[PDB]
Symmetry: C4
């Protein structure tokens, strides 16, 4: 379960999205090194240009790559589902704007950890910070609070992200998350704890496609 | 006691307010899911327009809905009072402005958890950020520090909130709180600990009344 | 020792100051309620007008009033010295500006906890934020890191404060502190831990003297 | 005097950096002292080649985590002192938001009674009119958290952290640090459980030093084990 993550694992991400009727797709590829909580991914919009800012898609675009320290190993739900994996669902409410609803399957396809997602965004403002593209290309560090959900044999999580806006304000997104295993194998249901995240977004100056390069470090703490 | 909160519980909130002589009332309705620390409430001003910003009323408008993790269950004062409930009193000092004094009864009325409040505000500046309505419609995340009060058979709490102002500054409100059980049944007096809060305020575009929609997630930590 | 702080204790503060040759004095009076980490003080400049902002004097103007939770009672150095008390010395380095050197005696005189201080400030800029009075009248929350000093039979502490400047920046003050008992009685030398502080400054609209009203809540944590 | 014992008093420090950023070569020398018992350092740095081509704040993290205060209960988790006096190699990659990267390699060890940090730094792909080569970073420093992880294969540690650099327009520019430390000797070392270092720093100027220079005071403590 854990054993599938002891080395460098290749990652594939596919997203099909529709926000206020604007349809788009994203494909990402890279690799994860869970032993040290690290991911590097590169994403392209395969349908032309994204109709929303990249930073709004970061949280939707594999918490099985978090570093769980030794003493918290029995609290790593995400890896304990693998290889059959899990369904991750969220509702994401943007301050003063619309909402994303997402559903994703996270599992191994051969040697690759794959995250396949559907996203639906509704009630955004056409001249808001999202559809108006006024969010800075960067990302803050966040804390994801994880709770067992014994009835679903999985977890829930709750967290706010803070997105910098070009006028120097921050726009919050409140995330409600639930994860459910796909297989019937046993899983590790955790005591409450958090994941601390740090991310850096960057650009490849020679990629003419709409794109995002992402590096991330995630670790678990609080037991 | 705890058993009253194991599912979704309907909530009713009623506030009678007077700030610098301006009288108003608010009614709120929604539901709470203490198992995962969640609340959703919708509030209306039933007297016309509020004389103060909505964000100034959030803290006054049911800490019995906080998620206490399993190991901290013996520290959940709030639920241990139920159904007879508790009196919550606060003094709230606004930076460079007036103060709110509040008193509230929190208890079950039938299957509904009801928070009934009186609020009195004094010495506000007529052209300050409060009576001048210069506070942003949003809310930050906060830490509420909880202490047992053995003499009162209850608790005290202390915390600052930070309210964003439209000129990009923050205005602090310093909260002094005390809670006292209404019944004589035994209660759980806690070791020191905190509640971490996260909130999102929103608007219903079709509600013409002065109103606030609130979603909140609260969890206990620090033992 | 602890027993001296079980109720409300009156406080007296006296400061003699000289900053770049500008001499001034301050007297404060109020009371502290260490059981709940609280204090309220009112300070006046007894020599006319202060030559530096009030916020620069807050840290120098009784950590014996911090709330130590039950499990941390053996780590409360400050109360363990009482009534004979302690000498508190600091060096305070202001970002891009001068420094304060302070020495204070903190001890009971009769039933009153008295803080008597000498402050010497050097190398301030005449048109900096301090001597130019460009610091906002407010205060942030801070973390004071406490370490035993076995050779001195006391403690050291280190912390930065952050002072809001009227142009929207923050100016840091780095504090180096040391406390030494006055008596030869035994004291409690603590394990490393912190004090978390929260403060609110206010003004009495009918006090014509240069003055500061201060409310503060301080608690110990981290064992 | 081995490991921890070498740090019980005040230890003199020497720092030497050879740098090249987008082809601009420079050197820095620092001297001062560290008092690990209370997590404190005071250092003064000069650019010995004229003027620095990048802001001083971009060099602070590269310019001796052996001076951190490890509290008593965390003593078995102090990798850095356990290597001494033979010391360690510290390597980093530092990625600046919207700009280039630094790669650094440093040897940290005792030379006689002095703890010496000798560094090579190479910066690439910076923008000529960015905040770094354009000198638009404020002369100050924030407080940070450095997350430390054992690396059992290398007999050492890794660390990960973001710094946040204030920019003159009131924004912050993040630098993401990837770090690895490897002992130089073959003696045994202390491999830690996960934990963090909390940092606080103050930069200042000596009004009578005409050279390009930085005075730095810092306090670092370890935390996060039961
Ligand atoms: Na988001
Ligand atoms: Na996102
Ligand atoms: Na408030
Ligand atoms: Na409020
Ligand atoms: Na200060
Ligand atoms: Na101060
Ligand atoms: Na840096
Ligand atoms: Na740096």
């Amino acid at each position: 379960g854990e054993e599938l993550f002891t080395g460098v694992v290749p990652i594939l991400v596919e997203l099909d999205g529709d926000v206020n009727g604007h349809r788009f797709s994203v494909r990402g590829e890279g690799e994860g090194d869970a032993t040290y909580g690290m991911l590097t991914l590169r994403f392209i919009c395969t349908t032309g240009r994204l109709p929303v800012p990249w930073p709004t898609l970061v949280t939707t675009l594999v918490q099985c790559f978090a570093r769980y320290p030794d003493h918290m190993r029995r609290h790593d739900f995400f890896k304990s589902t693998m290889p059959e994996g899990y369904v991750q669902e969220r509702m994401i409410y943007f301050e003063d704007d619309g909402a994303y609803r997402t559903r994703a399957v996270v599992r191994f396809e051969g040697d690759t950890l794959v995250n396949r997602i559907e996203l639906r965004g509704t009630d955004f403002r056409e001249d808001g910070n999202i559809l108006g593209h006024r969010l800075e290309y960067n990302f803050n560090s966040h804390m994801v609070y994880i709770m067992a959900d014994r009835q679903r044999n999985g977890i829930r999580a709750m967290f706010n992200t803070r997105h910098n806006v070009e006028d120097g304000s921050e726009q919050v997104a409140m995330h409600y998350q639930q994860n459910t295993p796909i297989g019937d194998g046993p899983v590790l249901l955790p005591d409450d704890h958090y994941l601390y995240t740090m991310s850096l977004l960057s650009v490849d100056p020679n990629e003419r496609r709409d794109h995002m390069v992402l590096r991330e470090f995630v670790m678990a703490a609080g037991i």
